[PDB]
RNA sequence: CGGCGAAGAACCGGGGAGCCG
RNA sequence: CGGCGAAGAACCGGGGAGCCG
């Protein structure tokens, strides 16, 4: 229905929480891209070891090629309610529809966590 | 002073007129390049056959580089009193730093008695 | 019609956080 | 204090006349 068609699963609230905090968290020892553009070049450049979609995207084409982009590149990806909740996440004044953790710093390990639990919705 | 210092030498008023009567005329005939990023690509190219500087460029570094630019590719070089001249004799609607011919078109004879006055002066 | 635009519109690639009053 | 900016600022490169209300 309102969720667009690029938004290929759900991610328990919960999930996506643990999924912002540690996003901004990794800021401090790792390194994210954010935006779509730096988000993209860092998917098709082999560097994303986990990418953020916002699910309000609005116009939904802004985001739309990077789920089937990361499945391609066999880069896990997990969806977020909110392009403000993300560009707060990320440090900036303004919402953000996509980013990329691409260095996991201090972080690997709870990382890896949240990925396997991504898998496991499907 | 009052003129910057790229305007390394005098042009009288019968010839800049004679040169901006001409540079309006090779529109319709030959070609032109309008604009100070053009004009230094198209010397840079080597296919400048006139360049136009206007005397009044204000901040100067706009177009300083041009004339010994010019010498270094063998491109001769006239000045114009007035950018708003050099605008309306290119035919475009806001004022103009710098212009060249690129080609004569039918007025062959006109540049040539131009170009050699312009190497008279100095 | 005004405002802006060759001191470089649109558009494209690089870039990745400031620009303006 | 505002207006704008990750839906991509500044800036570099390509482009060469439109963009806006
Ligand atoms: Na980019
Ligand atoms: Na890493
Ligand atoms: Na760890
Ligand atoms: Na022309
Ligand atoms: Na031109
Ligand atoms: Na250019
Ligand atoms: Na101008
Ligand atoms: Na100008
Ligand atoms: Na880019
Ligand atoms: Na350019």
New binding site residues.
Partial sequence: GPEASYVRFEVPEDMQNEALSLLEKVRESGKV?????????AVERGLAKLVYIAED???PE??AHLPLLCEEKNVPYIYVKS?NDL?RA?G???????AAIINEGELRKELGSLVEKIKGLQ
């Fill in positions: 891209k954010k935006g779509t553009n730096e988000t993209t070049k995207v609005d116009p802004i985001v392009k560009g990320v900036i004044e303004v919402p953000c529809a996509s």
